[PDB]
Amino acid sequence: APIDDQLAELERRDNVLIGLYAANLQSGRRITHRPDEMFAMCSTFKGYVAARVLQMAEHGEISLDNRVFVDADALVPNSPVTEARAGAEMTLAELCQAALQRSDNTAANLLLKTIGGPAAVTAFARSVGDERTRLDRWEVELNSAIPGDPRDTSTPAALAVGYRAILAGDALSPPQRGLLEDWMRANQTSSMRAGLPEGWTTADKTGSGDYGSTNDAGIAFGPDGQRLLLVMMTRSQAHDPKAENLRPLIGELTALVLPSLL
């Protein structure tokens, strides 16, 4: 594969590992790099969490406007929305959008307490065909991303199936899938968005952790109706827990793969 040699070049140049699953949803064409290698998922588990909340609301197990108390003591770094409401209540729907749109960490912990913790996310993964995702810890420990450590990891292929399931498949009844898509489209964190031409938009979840772990998973929507499933997981090859994250590389990856999918 020639796009295969281009990706090996980016790895060499930046001392990174690139995990990629990119599919054109209309043509059924897919492109892959380390699709089955394990990467820390970091905040990308939040889509599955919000998806499961929506599933549970469908059946009346919970309700989206159910209130949850935000304890100041439960606050954890990178919680821009839950911080504003510490000592008060947010609804589950609010917590979902905080987790998805701003990667609010405490929002995700609260959502995890509601749905059954890390094991519930794993079970969810399995329910949608995702056989590699395992969540083991809470925010913010899950982002530790130690090389070789299987905890809180997935693979580009495994995350693609689940992201496809929840945004373009049958995990949710179609109108609730529509809401999940709207929730992710309003996100303020997209990395891939920078490598897309004018007119394109994304329903995607980014993740960032140690060792430069920088992820972005979701669907890119073309102006002319096109639909691209894009899952990018990258980490430094170095044993530097504090290696720089690779946000500009995602955007560069996005622009690189797009012409070979269209």
- What contacts 36, CB < 8 A, 6 or more positions away? 132, 155, 156, 157
Q: Is 135 exposed, middle or buried (0-12, 13-18, 19+ CB in 10 A)?
A: buried
Give me the helix-helix angle, 117-127 and 45-58, nearest 10°. Answer: 80
**Exposed/middle/buried for residue 24 (C-beta within 10 Å: 0-12, 13-18, 19+):** middle
120, 52 Cβ separation under 8 angstroms: yes
Angstrom resolution of this structure: 2.1
Residues 6+ apart with CB under 8 A from 125: 48, 131, 132, 133, 134, 154, 158, 162
3-class secondary structure for the chain? CHHHHHHHHHHHHHCEEEEEEEEECCCCCEEEECCCCCEECHHHHHHHHHHHHHHHHHCCCCCCCCEEECCHHHCCCCCHHHHHCCCCEEEHHHHHHHHHHHCCHHHHHHHHHHHCHHHHHHHHHHHCCCCCCCCCCCCCHHHHCCCCCCCCEECHHHHHHHHHHHHHCCCCCHHHHHHHHHHHHCCCCCCHHHHCCCCCEEEEEEEECHHHCEEEEEEEECCCCCEEEEEEEEEECCCCCCCCCCHHHHHHHHHHHHHHCC
242 belongs to an annotated ligand binding site:
no
Distances (CA, A) of 18 to 3, 80, 200, 231, 235: 12, 30, 23, 11, 7
Sheet hosting strand 227-236, strand order edge to edge: 30-33, 16-24, 227-236, 214-221, 201-208
46 among annotated binding-site residues: no
Report the CATH number at residue 15: 3.40.710.10
Other CB atoms within 10 A of residue 34 CB: 19
Those residues whose C-beta lies under 8 Å from the C-beta of residue 103, and which sit 6 or more positions away, are 43, 46, 78, 189, 205, 206, 207, 208
Residues 6+ apart with CB under 8 A from 196: 202, 220, 254, 255, 258
Which residue range(s) make up the domain with 227?
A: 1-262
Residues 42, 145: Cα–Cα separation, whole Å: 8
* Cβ-contact 221, 201 below 8 angstroms: yes
The single-letter code of the amino acid at 136 is D
Q: Give Cα 96 distance to the centre of its chain.
A: 13
As a whole number of angstroms, the distance between CA 192 and CA 215 comes to: 10
Q: Which residues participate in catalysis according to the annotation?
A: 43
CA distance 254 to 99: 23
Q: From 206, 196, 200, select the one nearest 253 (Cα to Cα).
A: 196
**C-alpha span between 19 and 246 (Å, rounded):** 13
Using what technique was this structure determined? X-ray
Domain count, the chain: 1
Pick from 173, 144, 48, 168: which is nearest to 99 by CA? 48
